[PDB]
Subunit: 380 residues, 4 copies
């Protein structure tokens, strides 16, 4: 069976006891013990419960892993996975990482003797150069926000393997549908399920999957010990969202590709960043490790002036910090994700004041293209 | 107004826009920005949202604090508050702390150069003795599980203040109704809302309150940065539970006191541990810092044999790891909370194989006493 | 075991398969059939499901009945129970019935040849007088809104029995805790669970219980056939609310009694209507069929002017159409429940423009009495 | 904008007060009134609330109507719409109607002097023949279950209009995406939102839309008066489901068409019933009133023996009473929907013991076709 069938045909398609086609919501913190000595499958909801257990198994299945872990947020999943390191440990990490990941490495784990260097993970040499004797982790996020730069997961993993260092990949942007980091040599794959997996902007959630039973024991231990667990009612919303992940992402990715091609040929558009354009650096690497360019693109207008005119005229997209919704989302990274950086740090990452990110939702591609046409008509 | 009125008469008694007497559930991760430059009250649910904000303000109000913080679990609240420390920092902590707190200090923060000594916080001298130049935190849990030993919050706080060290108090057992650690000199108060606050065994939740605006900025920063947030639907269940906290705890505490007095006079009962018994060490300290002995007691039968006979015959209580439910809960700490300790560590904490904890629920006190009578009839 | 123990100690205290102390939410419309010929306990959620089934059994237990039925609203329960009648059938009904019941008899069932006469059910003679050969139903609501008039359930039932006519009792105001109409000769007992049973103003729900297996088959058939079912997530909120019904109502009823006695002695108060006042007509009948006067009272100020002054000054109560909340609710029946009547119909029911209803919540009785004192201070 | 854009771009895409991209869940029964005289937008949740109001407006928008009405179940929507009739009124109704509709006309409304004749609504002459002077309603369900017979909505409506009789259409099978009965002359359109609209088998819900403001006042009055309302938390699940209705139904309908063509050419299949087959009676009528054949087909094997062999071997579909799920559902109408009929009534409707219905979900069409191939391999 292909992965689009597995979203529906798995262990949780029908409850044994009742035939229920949806996993019941166990809104219970306490489980009665029918025996004094042996405890029963569940003692305590934080430790485990049937709703969370189903989401954990299904994400492990989608990513080709042995165990899955559900967290209160994607950043809680990322933070918990970093607790796998101890003081003294060094981290090579993408200079383009999610702002939340940036903040946890620089402001929290720095107080606990976990050091880091930010690097271009797309440059295998610059990576090689900054290796240290205590380097225990390579942290990859591909494709990158908001220019969709591509990291060669296989090559970064091989380098990590060569010094017994771990590889973590934040696979939020493409989901398990399009990219499977564990098959490419990653040790931990991390998701903000808040984004495309849940897909409806209605729940905050994080997932991690591993393939190694020792790492699984350690991450499971940290999930329970820090306690940043996804509540059962939130697991249920993620489980429901997962059921449409194939039809949502196939449609949004295909329409993102058409809109990228249309924007790349408009005379008022300076640059388009999308890994499905042949001229996009990483095009080759993307095709070798993923089965789609995804549903997110960025583009540059002529000036900050054009960009503000465009935003004032477009009707269809929501204007928000986030992505991966069934509604199209326009973001202004210079004013949102990257506002807190120096102008110099934004200039180095190519994050100009003319740049917009589009997360493509489920609107008719022809309505999205017309809405853009119309808004671009009032520019230049 | 007394605190039992404030549970209902506060800022959230009626929604401004609609009159709603309950805070709407904002099941939203994304907020549309109506302006390019200024953002609106909410950008992103993890950062803040109206449902979580109401629970945070109401727990701050109940504890007499300036800011409240809602987490995915009590242990996530405790773990996040420990991230206030850095490597090098030393912690004086209760040897009787919750097993989850024990595990995070000994197995996680020990890998980050945060050291600790476990002490009897009821012995001001033993505390004084183990102070170090780098001691930054005193961690109090009063009353203690499962012997309900009492810590003098005011005296421990004064000692902490005298070396510019922080005081944290885990106030899960008594709730803000009965004990207000911030008024007694604590810097952070911590709750498993999973227990009495929510009160219905149906949601996992943690709370922290502070009175100092700097600590509030730091803890708020850590809440967002690690991301172990309480989801809005779970906040709603905690908000609903809080509305009965006075009528639930007044009834359970009063019935716990009657059952403690009845058990202390039964010939088949060896010991009763309850801070409302005049003969309980800490009786005086409890009355000076709290307005009730609470809803939890422990007692010892003659042998492990009597205890197993009693458990086989009692009908009313649930048998579980937890407490603070509307259903009465019997626990066997030697087999549950403290199973993982050495026999020597259990012998030192007074945690014998004859000892049961009772969390008193809302059953008729006369039905509970009869059910105990009946079960004790088949013993000795 | 007393009824306050049965709220917690029943078939649903611990899930067989898992120990769950709360009934899982079966958010499922479809159940997989593991066999072609036999169907399994559940085929379809509207027909039945485990969450609704638990609420149905627990309300049957509380009311001393054989079967319970959960509906989308109290008025849906009342409307479904009226479908037990056919065209030609005549109904004797309380002239003081809930406005929703009034509207369904007069505007809907009147188009289907179900006729009625409105009567004082407190006058056994006026009832006797308006009996007809086709009278199939006596509809009782005791105590009445908003003057809390009392109907003798036993005597009305005996009269009904004597002509093979049914008795329905709307027991919303007192709940099964205080009044058990099935033990007093009623055939159907009806609840707005929206009110005291759920108790938190957060869910709309109706219940019906019967003791006769034929009526149970007919009402079950109508529940399924019209389909006005309570959804599983709403059943869960009602199940959660039921767990505090004893501690909520014991506190509110006791405080209602103190506030009734205090209002009856204030010089600016003209009348108090409460079945716990010795001078209240029905006092004797109430004590004979119920174990409390309940949590609702009404009172009259000197004028509409005093009433408006009082409302402008009181701080604690919410001002709303409803009752049975953990927050105290003041209502103005002349402007709310009974606005749509003629002045003549309000004059006959004693529903003056000086009259307020109070549903007593969980606020400190001394804060409620002070808040009333203070507001009455600005009157006369 | 096309309808697939309107599923996302409507009045509820962003909350005014907060930017919320999802409508908050108003779990509130009571609304505080800030004024004594005027009431505020909401008085009581049964009467109206913001979550239900959004679902009601969005379904009105999709069906091209002026008002929408949300009910506890599709059968509650159908039953409420029948309360538009009075005793004496006569109904012409499809002999193939949903079993719940059949039961309410024959067992409930028959006791209230509402008479009916069951007819082939696909035969304009047989309809014409059974008209009576008191005929007030024509009840259409197209396409029919389980042979997908097609009713000419325009022609049935014209006939109804010609005697001032109402037209109701149950549009559950095609949804507003594919068929708009109000544009074809229907007065009321009815949905089981339980099926494709919600689409995830996780909520029971009904909808009705009208275009006429008088009918809207009458149906709104009956929605409130009988009280068979959809709770806010259930409205939220329907609102969430609606967001994927285009990508779900476009995929399922396209795959249903491929599977219908594949089954029609298999040598072990006797008949295929699908309105997208050129040889299906109603093919022409379907294309004239709808933009797709939909996601449901039926087919006949050689014998009851083949059918039981096929069911024993197929792996992918769930086996259930229902349809319109993201999981493929096989049903056996002779044993499920139509078990309760005489063999003669099933013989007349063409509902043989060799017939299966398939509701196509979101599985890979090639996995569904292979799973059928494989199972058919063990037959004949």
């Amino acid at each position: 069976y292909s992965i689009d069938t597995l979203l529906l045909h798995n262990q949780y398609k029908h409850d044994s006891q009742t035939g229920a086609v949806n996993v019941p919501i166990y809104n219970t913190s306490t489980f009665h013990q029918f025996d004094v000595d042996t405890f029963g499958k569940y003692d305590y909801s934080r430790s485990g419960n049937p709703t969370r257990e189903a989401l954990e198994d299904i994400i492990a299945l989608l990513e080709g892993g042995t165990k899955g872990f559900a967290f209160a947020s994607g950043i809680a999943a990322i933070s918990t996975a970093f607790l796998l390191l101890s003081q003294g440990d060094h981290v090579l990490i993408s200079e383009d990482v999610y702002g939340g990941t940036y903040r946890v490495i620089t402001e929290v784990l720095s107080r606990y003797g976990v050091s880091h260097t930010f690097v271009d993970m797309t440059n295998l040499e610059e990576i090689k150069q900054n290796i240290k004797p205590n380097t225990k982790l390579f942290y990859v996020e591909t494709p990158s926000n908001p220019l969709l730069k591509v990291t060669d997961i296989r090559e970064v993993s091989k380098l990590a393997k060569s010094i017994g260092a771990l590889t973590f990949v934040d696979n939020t942007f493409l989901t398990p549908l399009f990219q499977k980091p564990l098959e490419l040599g990653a040790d931990v794959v991390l998701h903000s399920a808040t984004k495309f997996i849940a897909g409806h902007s209605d729940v905050t959630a994080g997932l991690a999957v591993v393939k190694d039973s020792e790492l699984a024991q350690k991450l499971g231990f940290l999930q329970n010990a820090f306690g940043a667990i996804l509540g059962p009612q939130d697991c249920s919303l993620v489980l429901r969202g997962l059921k449409t992940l194939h039809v949502r992402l196939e449609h949004s990715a295909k329409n993102a590709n058409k809109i990228a091609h249309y924007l790349q040929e408009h005379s008022k558009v300076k640059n388009v960043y999308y890994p499905g354009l042949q001229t996009h650096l990483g095009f080759d690497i993307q095709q070798s490790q993923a089965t789609s360019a995804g549903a997110v693109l960025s583009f540059t207008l002529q000036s900050e002036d054009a960009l503000r005119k465009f935003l004032s005229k477009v009707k269809l997209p929501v204007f928000a910090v986030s992505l991966g919704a069934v509604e199209s989302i326009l973001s202004y990274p210079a004013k949102m994700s990257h506002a807190a950086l120096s102008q110099e740090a934004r200039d180095k990452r190519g994050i100009s004041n003319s740049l917009l990110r589009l997360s493509v939702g489920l609107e008719n591609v022809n309505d999205l293209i017309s809405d853009f046409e119309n808004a671009l008509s009032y520019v230049e």
